[PDB]
Amino acid sequence: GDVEKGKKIFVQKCAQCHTVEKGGKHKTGPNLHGLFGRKTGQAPGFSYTDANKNKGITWGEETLMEYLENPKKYIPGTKMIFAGIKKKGEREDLIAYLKKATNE
Ligand code: HEC
Numbered sequence: 779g780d781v782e783k784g785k786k787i788f789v790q791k792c793a794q795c796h797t798v799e800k801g802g803k804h805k806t807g808p809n810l811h812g813l814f815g816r817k818t819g820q821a822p823g824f825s826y827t828d829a830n831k832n833k834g835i836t837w838g839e840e841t842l843m844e845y846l847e848n849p850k851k852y853i854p855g856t857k858m859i860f861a862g863i864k865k866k867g868e869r870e871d872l873i874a875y876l877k878k879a880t881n882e
Contacts, residue, residue, distance in 0.1 A: 779875070
């Protein structure tokens with residue numbers, strides 16, 4: 779995907795609840811640094827729902843593609859309020875941005 783396009787998507791749809799940078803703060807949602815290769819619900823010091831702690835998948839390109847299409851269908855009972863992104867390219871750009879920014 780296109781990293782700079784994904785940044786614009788992140789800032790528009792995600793940044794109000796999430797930071798990405800190393801040492802970034804939790805907000806409404808958890809900081810996402812280190813997300814890739816981490817299991818669900820494992821950012822330290824954040825009140826996750828049991829739902830998000832129990833989903834039990836490893837976050838990566840493919841599981842984020844499925845999650846971001848419809849978060850509540852993938853993790854029923856999640857307290858993340860976000861409808862999803864049905865568009866494929868948008869998700870791919872976003873995920874490419876996240877794979878850079880949450881690893882930098
Ligand atoms: C506030 C209204 C949010 C919006 C906008 C976005 N996210 Fe979110 N996210 C939010 C919360 C409160 C939580 C915890 C949910 C729970 O049930 O505990 C989350 C969680 C995630 C995760 C899982 C993180 C993990 O398992 O460590 C991811 C990958 C995630 N959120 C990504 C994300 C994306 C990419 C967003 C824009 C498209 C987005 N969220 C918006 C709160 C909010």
